[PDB]
Structure 1
Amino acid sequence: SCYIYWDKIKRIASRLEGMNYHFDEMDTSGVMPLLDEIEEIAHDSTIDFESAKHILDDAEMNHALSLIRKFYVNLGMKLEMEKAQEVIESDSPWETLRSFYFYPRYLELLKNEAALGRFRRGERAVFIGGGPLPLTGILLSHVYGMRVNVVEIEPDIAELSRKVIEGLGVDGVNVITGDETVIDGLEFDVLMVAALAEPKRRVFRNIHRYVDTETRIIYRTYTGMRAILYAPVSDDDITGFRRAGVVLPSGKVNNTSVLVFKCP
């Protein structure tokens, strides 16, 4: 094969090489054009899923793919961290939050997930992998009227995220510091897993031990050319579960959302 996107990807990657192993030092505003380049390819609806797989699975693409994924994960983390701090310091926290680069996609992502998982007011949600800016948790309560526990493994990140929630004056959203195993002492209707929650194998194996067959579990992954951004959840990762539904993204939304149930 001979896809035009192959060379386009190699070229972008060539301009990332010089940042390798130090992407966390990126200037956030300065690198937005690079994210645009990458997203032009990721979001191209003329690329079929078989062609995307052809490109992303080729051994000659391994190194370029690694660079793009490192860039993406580090930019996302830094953008969230910076916005969390801005929200806490703001006189207009909800307006500040609404200016977050990814805010509109999150609204769409959540709308997708709420249909998939049939969310209702007063249902209890647990979200694994809150991060510094726990936007999903916030919207679960703010839009969908759910009662929410967000789980975050890093104590300092957890503390920041609580300050964001409090700054906004959002109710019914609590942050629990811990690993995924904290769900043992929770009672909940819906469990969600962040796209960035890692390592997938350990996390899903632990979830399997603590949910029953009625618990709606939604996790986020990457399909098609969007898999250029981040490694998709593998089939091995979700052993012991059955897939019940999927929402594939459109527009600028990156994540595919997957509904699974514990077997049987």
Structure 2
Amino acid sequence: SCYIYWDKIKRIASRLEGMDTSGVMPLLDEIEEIAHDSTIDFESAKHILDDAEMNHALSLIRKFYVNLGMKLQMEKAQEVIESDSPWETLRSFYFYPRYLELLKNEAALGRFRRGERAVFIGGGPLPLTGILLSHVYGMRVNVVEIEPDIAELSRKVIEGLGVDGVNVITGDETVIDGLEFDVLMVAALAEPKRRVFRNIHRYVDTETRIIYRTYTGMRAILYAPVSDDDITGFRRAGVVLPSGKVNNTSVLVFKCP
């Protein structure tokens, strides 16, 4: 092999090695131009990313991606809380249009209905999907967030927005033991995958629609995919591969029998 992206990735990584949310946006663009390149097939993608010589470069890019991701969420959270026009400020979040698309295809993958009960594991500072489950899909939502200070901030976001029927529970994935719900979603950044799915397995039954977010193809450059082994005791029952600028693949699983 001799893919032109091999060198391009290596070069972007050289500029992260020694390393302002606004001022690093062009780095994101460079990385996403490659991730989103639809001429790169899943075999090619895997050839680049699975290669031992690519190991360090992959880790630099992934580190950058989750860091900018988090910082953009933080910043927006606070912005939303301080805003006279919170829903307008929410709408201008860099990733907003993407999340709409994503949750739009998940709603179909998961047959979402008004009044169903959704649980969302890993809400973060800006619980946007939580918010959209209720605001758009009219579901009754519990968002779960492990870090108390982030959970506290996420409540101030929900409250600032005046969204109804979205509550934030401070805790790990085992808080699902005392909940009743129709749909369970697992955030892309919900970690650690192996423990998270072992525990989910304990507290759902075979009818619970479970949706998780992962990364497939060239988009795996952004984050480590949920493995086969991670979803032991489940079966896949539908997948949505992304297009456009949407980065996550959404997978629907059911607990085995």
Report the TM-score when normalising by structure 1: 0.97
- Report the alpha carbon displacement of residue 9 of structure 1 after superposing the two structures with TM: 0.3
How many Å separate the matches in 2 of 1:126 and 1:160? 18
Pick aligned residue for 2:65 from 58, 64, 72: 72
Deviations 1:198-218 (A, max 9, x none): 000000000000000000000
Aligned partner of residue 113 in structure 2, secondary structure: coil
Residues 186-237 of structure 1 show CA distances to partners (whole Å, capped at 9, x for unaligned) of: 0000000000000000000000000000000000000000000000001111
**Structure 1 alignment gaps of length 5 or more:** 19-25
Please give the per-residue CA displacement for 1:92-123, whole angstroms capped at 9, x wherever unaligned.
00000000000000000000100000000000
**Structure 1 position 96 matched with structure 2 position 57:** no
The Cα shift of 1:45 comes to: 0.5
Distance 2:75 2:209 in 1: 32
Please state whether the residue corresponding to 2:244 is helix, strand or coil: coil
CA distance in 2, matches of 1:17, 1:184: 43
Deviations 1:16-37 (A, max 9, x none): 000xxxxxxx810110000000
CA-to-partner distance for each residue in 1:111-150, whole Å, 9 max, x for gaps? Answer: 0100000000000000000000000000000000000000
The separation in 1 between residues aligned to 2:105 and 2:12, in whole angstroms, is: 31
Cα separation, 1, equivalents of 2:168 and 2:77: 15
3-state secondary structure, aligned to 2:207? coil
Once the two structures are TM-superposed, the CA of residue 84 in structure 1 deviates from its matched residue by 0.1
In the alignment, what sits opposite 1:105?
A: 98
CA distance in structure 2 between the partners assigned to 1:131 and 1:98 by the alignment: 17
1:40 and 1:207 mapped to 2: Cα distance?
Answer: 35
Note the alpha carbon deviations across 1:58-103, whole angstroms, 9 max, x for none. Answer: 1000000000000000000000000000000000000000000000
- Between the aligned partners of 1:185 and 1:214, the Cα distance in structure 2 is 17
SS at structure 2 position matched to 1:174 = strand
Three-state SS of the structure 2 residue aligned to 1:15 is: helix
Shift of 1:255: 0.1
- Pairing of 1:26-45 with structure 2 (within 5 A): 27-45=20-38
Secondary structure at the aligned position of 1:163 is classed as: helix
Distance 1:191 1:121 in 2: 15
Pair 1:210-2:203 in alignment: yes
Identity of matched residues, %: 100
* 1:159-187 residue CA offsets vs partner (Å, 9 max, x unmatched): 00000000000000000000000000000
Question: Over the residues paired in the alignment, what is the CA RMSD in angstroms?
Answer: 0.6
Q: Provide the C-alpha distance between the structure 2 equivalents of 1:198 and 1:27, rounded to a whole number of angstroms.
A: 26
Q: Distance in 2 between matches of 1:13 and 1:163?
A: 37
In 2, Cα distance between equivalents of 1:119 and 1:2: 45
CA distance, structure 1, for counterparts of residue 147 and residue 224 of structure 2: 22
CA distance in 2, matches of 1:234, 1:133: 26
Q: Secondary structure at the match of 2:114?
A: coil
Answering whether residue 214 of structure 2 is matched by residue 225 of structure 1, we say no
| More deviation, 26-35/164-173 | 26-35
The CA distance in 1 between the partners of 2:33 and 2:47, in whole Å, is 18
Query: Using the alignment, how far apart are the partners of 2:28 and 2:5 within structure 1?
Result: 16
Q: Distance in 2 between matches of 1:178 and 1:65?
A: 31
- Once residues 234 and 146 of structure 1 are traced to their aligned partners in structure 2, the CA distance between those partners, rounded to angstroms, is 29
